[model samples]
Structure formats: structure tokens, C-alpha cells
Target: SNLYHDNTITVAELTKKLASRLIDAGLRLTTAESCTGGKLSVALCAEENTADFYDVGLVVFSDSAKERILGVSPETLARFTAVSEQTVTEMAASIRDIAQADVSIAISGYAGPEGGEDGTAAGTVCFAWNIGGKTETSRVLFSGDCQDVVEKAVHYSLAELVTKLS
Candidate 1:
């Protein structure tokens, strides 16, 4: 199932909730991002005590970066492009393992006004969140321009955090 909301929420709110959750649980968070770039990590680290709970974040915008930084196998990338569900899940799990964090999240997709090959429409975002050994995924057909797609990606990341952490 997908969790797509219409309302808009700010980065500050996301950071606040994330910090509180990490501080409360004494857990750490990490991210492997592509389409959203470092937005997820940036929001989580916006507040103080970030170092205490956020160990590392990687922005693997390219397929090579995914392999080199997150250790996603070449075969995996070849089978599934960067925006695919398989790739995102691997990125999340790998980021969590490499960062040694309690939780990990990954985002990738085409946040373009123009669609891509296979008619993968614009604002197609895929996300994976990992806690312990379990991973959850959500894929959505989003709307709006580039910024809107990015915002939607951030919103989904925050919503997942809220749902799982609570």
C-alpha cells in the first residue's frame, strides 16, 4: 500500500519529529538517497544533537555511486534502475548496514516534468525504510513540477518515520 498525502509540511517539522524519535529511542538514522538527493539527510540533521543520532548519509545520484557507496551489485542496478523498488530497498538495507544505524531510509525516482522511458511518468518516487532487519516500501505516482516531486518524496519519508517510529 501507498501513503500519499495532499497537504504540505515543512522541513522543520520533519526534523523535529525525527530528532525527538531518535533521542527518545537512543537510536541512530541513516539515508541513501538519489532523486531526493540529500534532502532526507539534510532534514534529519537540521537540528542539534544530529551527530548523536545521525551517523552518515549518502547521496548516490548515479548507478556507480550506488555500487561504490552502498555496495549495490551491478547486476541489481542493471536489472532494476535507480528508481526501482528493488534498488531502493537494497539501498536502504545497505545504508543501514554500512552506517550501523538503527533505521535507514532511501528515495529514488524521476522527479521530472517530463516522463521517462517505459512511460514512467514524472514524479514517480520509490522509497524504502528499514528498521532492524525488516524493511517497508512505498511507491507513489506523485504530481507537480520538480520541486513538488522532491517535496512529495520528503513528505513520504517523514510520514514513514512517524508511522514506524511511533
Candidate 2:
């Protein structure tokens, strides 16, 4: 059973729920975003009175930005490329360390009409969550246009945060 399958709950509703959870937990979050651009960051700050829970949002779209801004290793990027679980994981960890936040989320992927590298296809996204000294990573293949994929990724990232906070 997919938790996101309950279409009755809107993304706004989930965002509020996630905001409440973060407030209750006294946690601040930061983001290192790529493919979804700043969508996840925008979503995190969408709720009223929740700004205090957000630390910072970095849009590291290019490999160099990931390396220069987030300290993603060049060797790692060379070995695994930007869309891999490894890169996202490093992004999450690096941002978490730099921001000194209670939690950090990182995202990278190809959500487009045509962009993909190696064996990864369009609509493939990798995500990483770092919380309480532990980091978790996953890759998801979403089916849709660019906006659809971005929206889904935002909702999915928020949902994952809620679960982790719980």
C-alpha cells in the first residue's frame, strides 16, 4: 500500500501535517535541491508560521555547484553521476553538516521531456534524507510531464519527512 495513494489528502494538507510534525519535534530542515529546482524548498516554506523550521535551501543544479556549494566529491560525481543515489546521499549529508540542521533533504534527477544519463531515464529522481545522524536514500521513477514530476517529488519528499519525524 502506497501512502501517497490516498488521493483524498491534498499536498497542502500533507504539507501542513509535515509542518506540524516538525514544529512538535523542534527540528529545523534544510534542502539541497537539483532537478525539482527549488520546488521542495518552496513547499517547505508554504505553510503559515513554519518559516522558523526552515534553515536554508540550496539549488545545486550543476555538478560543479554540487561540488562547490555542497562539497559533493568530484570523484563521486565522476563515478556515479549527479542522478545516482550516491550523489543525493552526499548532497544530503553535506548540506546537513553545513547547515547544522536537525534534518536535511537532497534531490537530484532528470525530470524532463528528454534528459537522462547513463542508464537513467527521464522521470527518474533520486532523493536523500538525513536525520538524527542517519541518512537514507532512494530513487523513484515518476511518470508524467515536467511539472507533474516536480509536484510529485515535492509531495513525496514532504511525506517522507513526516514519516521520519514520526
Candidate 3:
């Protein structure tokens, strides 16, 4: 069974739990978003005391923006594309340092109803989580339309972070 499909987790509940966890741990979180835009931030903002845990959410959706904002080198983008583990790893680390937050979540993907000039299938997403300078990454192939992919990515991004904290 698929992860999102089997879960009863709501964005509202997840954000609440995420906010609580970050606050309880005395940690602040930041986001580096690509394909999902700022949906991750939007989710965090839905909760109260957002400023307590989440301070910044960067929507670096373009290659140039990724390079300029997060210091994701053009060479990295050229070599691994924006959806690679390398790209998100750099993005996560850079934003965590830039925002001066203790934890960072980075995501990029082809959540397209029609992308993939490079054999990257639609709904293919990459994620990076940097906690205490320890970065880990994963690539997941989700199911659904463009919107579904995005919603799933946003959910997983936070859900995984909560788990990592515990």
C-alpha cells in the first residue's frame, strides 16, 4: 500500500504535531522548497506560534533561483539536475545555515502532469532533511496528478522530520 493513501494524517494535525515537536525540542525549522512551491511553509503557517518553530521557507523553484538563493552551484544543477539528492542536500544545508535555523527540510521533484525531458517521471520527488548538520536524503515515486504529488510531498516532508526528531 502507498504511504499517503494509508495514512489518516491531516495537514492540520501534522502541522500541529510538527510545531509542537519543534517547540518542545527548542529547535527552529526552515524549508527549502522547489517543485512543491511553498506548500510546506503554508502548512506550517496553518499552526499557531509559527514563529516559534518555523522562521523561513524558501521557494527556489527555478534553476537560477536555486543557484542564487541557496548557493546550489550551477555545476550541481548541471550534473544532477534540480531533483537529485545532491541538489537537495546542498539546498538543505545552505538554507539551514542561512536562516540560522537548527533544522532544514529541502524538497524538489517533477510533480508534473507532464514533465521529464530527462526520463525523470512525473511524481518523482526528492527530499533532504538536515538536523544538527547531519543530512539525509531520499527519492520517492508517488502516485497521482500534479496536485496529489505536491500534497503528498508536503506531508511527507514534515512527517519525516517529526520522526527524525524523535
Candidate 4:
């Protein structure tokens, strides 16, 4: 470990540890992220060769990209908005057709000072993880500005996956 002497760990350290674990477990990972840009992908690939299990990373910030690229249904988007459980569920389910990944996560959110038109608070994000053909979805309400929301979302998303996989 980079900080093996220390009791605590940073994201980089945690990722290195997780990277080795995933590599040992023979797992390939992918992500479909919105609002977080490509930070999640960067984190997954942060550990160099030990993190080589990564496969695909899609940054679908626009509604059209979610539809055209990831095949998130327009009807679902219209019904639930972009950052919603249903939408993220749709986003998560698309990964099976997108790649050969063993696990995939889809994230969407309102990471802003302004809330969504649907009355969702700012910093409210939706996350979904697909593992072994079973998908789990959750909504998190983080507190912060745009960057803060993004940071927290990235951390929370990774931590949750680590928790699940560990």
C-alpha cells in the first residue's frame, strides 16, 4: 500500500487496494456517469496496471447522449427526469449491451446551487450498480456546491462499490 504505514487511507490509496482486489477477482468494470464528468473513470484507472480491469467509461451529461449512446429511454427520461431512480435504472441496465464488463455503475444527478425542476434538491444524485446481473439503485442527497457535490458523489459512488464488493 502507498500509505501502508498509516492507519487511514485516501481515495488513491483505497483505489489501489480495490484495484488489486478486482484484478484478483477477475472483474472488469465500467461506468456511465452524468454530472460527475469522467472522475469516476479516472479513479478506476488511477491504480495503473493493477487497475487494468477497467473496460468502458461513458460521460453522458446530455439527455440525448443518455438516449442515443447508452439507450436510456426517452420515455423514462421524460417521466423521471435525468437524475432519477428510474432514469439511473435505465442507465444501469444499458451496460449489458454496451460492453463485456462484469460490473457497471450508472450515476446521474443535480450537482448545483439550483435544484431540479422536479423539486429535487441540489446535490441530490442517483446511483446504480450492476453486479452479477443484479442491479441495485440508490439516491443520495449530498450537501455542497457544484464541485462539492461532484467530489462527494465520486467518493460515495466508489465507497459504495467497494463496500458491496468487499
Candidate 5:
């Protein structure tokens, strides 16, 4: 069971629809990305009329980057390892505040041939969405190679945004 009434829609289609909705609502979006790099930002910028709804994208791949760019706390990074729900939550909230956009999304994970802490496997991704002053976070173990995982993360990020904003 899913709240996203049409899960069958393609990522491009969903991105188009989200752009329309954002324009209609006078809302803008910013993204803070790590594991997926700037792929999510590229996708949004590629959509039509993105200039009207897109704000900025931050690719904070390192703990220092996350801390310096998005103001993620050193305490959080030390405790959560930059790829946990706590870190993504901080990323989402901080980016939203920094960009002052109506919506924000943050992603951090290990999507790779390597790099995951204890209890986490490769391709395990964490995500957070901050919308209307509320924040939500989740984690999933995606099955794919590096590129494939990044693609899936980009799509999943957009779909999750549509669901929350709708």
C-alpha cells in the first residue's frame, strides 16, 4: 500500500508534475546530496520551468562538507556517520533553512563497491524530506551497481517529494 496514488509514473513524468505543483503553490525546492552526488540536482534542472521552482543544490559528500556547507553538526556526523537518518535529517533541515526554500530533500548513503559502516551494507541509502516545517527520514537497501543505485535514488527522491507535497 502506498500513498502515492500513481506509483507507475516515470521519474520524468513525476518531476514534470511536481514542477507544475510547485509553480502553482509558489514553492521552491533545494537539495542536499551525498551518495547520489548531484544527479538529483541535474534531474530537477533538466525539467521544464525549473527556474521557477528550483533554488539550489548542495553536494556535501564529506563530513566536513556537510558541516561546512549545510551546517550539519560535528556531533551528528560523529554519532551517525554521515549516512544515517540523523545526518540526513540534519541535512534536510539545515539546507531548507539555508536556502529558505519551501521544500528540501537530503540524501546520504553508501552506494558503492565499498564504504559502509558496521550494520550497514553497500547500497544502503538514507533519505530525508523537509516540507512545511516537518521533516521525515528513512533508509532502504537498494540493489544495484553504483550508477544504478544513484539512478534509483534520484527517482525515489523525486517520488517521495511528490508524495509529501501532494
Candidate 6:
């Protein structure tokens, strides 16, 4: 139900809250994005003070990009495509390693009107966050058009990032 946009807990609000907290803590964040197509990064960086905490972002929109940009191994991509817990974990770890941030988040999914080999019903998504030298992953199936999928993905990513910091 439009939870991704409800003011009570919208994606944009989460993005702003997490960004503020990170900036307050003097910690930076890095992103390795896939199905969200860098929208999560965009949301975080949209705030004027984002530079205080936002470090870097890479849009690993394809399996190849995941392999090339985030050092997600080709073997893993081959086995899991770009939308698996394994792949997103590697991506978050790699981003944290590369950017040297206190926290990192990576997301990948099949947020389409179409289906995939693993039968990722539209909006089948995976999220991973690395903090305190530990990484956590989650899977969600949202129902809607592309924008809805993206909003849901960003919402979860922001929540997880905040959870790590808290």
C-alpha cells in the first residue's frame, strides 16, 4: 500500500533521516546500486548537506557492472545473477573496502514488469548493509510499477543503514 510514500515512513524521509544521522556522527557512506539504478544514492545525495556524509556511489545496473565496478565476482554473478543475497553482500563489502566508509549499502533486484530465470516476480529485491565489520541482507517482494519498486528498495536500504548506525 503506498508505504514507500506515506509521510509516516516514506523513502525520502528515511533517506533524509539517515543522511542527517551519518553526518552528525561524522561518518560517510558508499553505495553499490543495481535495480534502483542509483536512485538510492540520488535520494541520499539530494539533501544539501549530503556531502557531509555521502562518500561515493556506483550504479551497478547490470551483472557486468556489478562485476566490474563493485568487484562482484563473475562467478557469483553467473550463479546468482545480480539479484541475490550473495551478490549484494559482496557488493556491500567491496564498497566498504574501497570507500573506507563506516557503513555501506548495496541493493539489487528484478524490479520490472517482466520475470527472470529464478522467477523473480516483479519487485523481487535484495538488500545488504555492512557496518561494524558485519553485513546483513534481506529479500522483499514489492508489488507495483517501476517507481513503486524503486521507492520500496530505497526505503529498505535507508532503514537498514540507519539500523547499522543505531
The lDDT leader among the candidates is: 3
Q: Which regions of candidate 5 fall more than 4 Å away from where they truly are? A: 1-7
Residue 149, candidate 5: Cα error in Å is 0.6
Better of 1 and 5 by lDDT: 5
Q: lDDT of candidate 1 vs native?
A: 0.83
For 56-159, candidate 2 gives per-residue lDDT tens digits of: 88887688888988888999999989998999998999888888888898999998877675767788999999886698988999999899999898888888
Give the per-residue lDDT of model 6 (tens digit) for 1-166.
5557443677667777897788788788889888888888888888888878887888866677667777889998788877889999999999988888888888888888875777778889998888756888998898898888988788878877776677
Which pairs in model 6 have colliding backbones? none
- Tally clashes: model 5: 0
Error of 4 at 86 (Å): 1.4
Candidate 1: tens digits of C-alpha lDDT, residues 1-166 = 7997767557787778878888898888888888887777777777887887888988877888888878878888777777788888889989898998989888988889766676788899888988886888888888899888887788788877876898
lDDT of 5: 0.88
Tell me the spans in candidate 4 whose CA falls farther than 4 Å from its real position. Answer: 1-9
Candidate number with the higher lDDT (3 or 6): 3
TM-score: model 5 vs. ground truth: 0.92
**Residue runs of model 2 more than 4 Å from their true location after superposition:** 1-7
Write the candidate numbers in order of decreasing TM-score: 3, 5, 2, 4, 1, 6
Better of 4 and 5 by TM-score: 5
Name the weakest run of 10 consecutive residues (lDDT summed) in model 6: 1-10
The Cα error of candidate 2 at residue 92, in Å, is: 0.5
Work out candidate 5's RMSD over C-alphas. Answer: 4.0
User: Cα deviation of 17 in candidate 3 (Å)?
Assistant: 1.3
For all candidates, the clash counts are: 0, 0, 0, 0, 0, 0
**Given candidate 5, what's the lDDT at residue 90?**
88
Against the unseen true structure, what C-alpha lDDT does each candidate score?
0.83, 0.85, 0.90, 0.84, 0.88, 0.83
After TM-score superposition, the amount by which residue 141's alpha carbon in candidate 1 deviates from its true location, in angstroms, is: 1.5
Assess the local accuracy of residue 41 in candidate 6 as a C-alpha lDDT between 0 and 100: 83
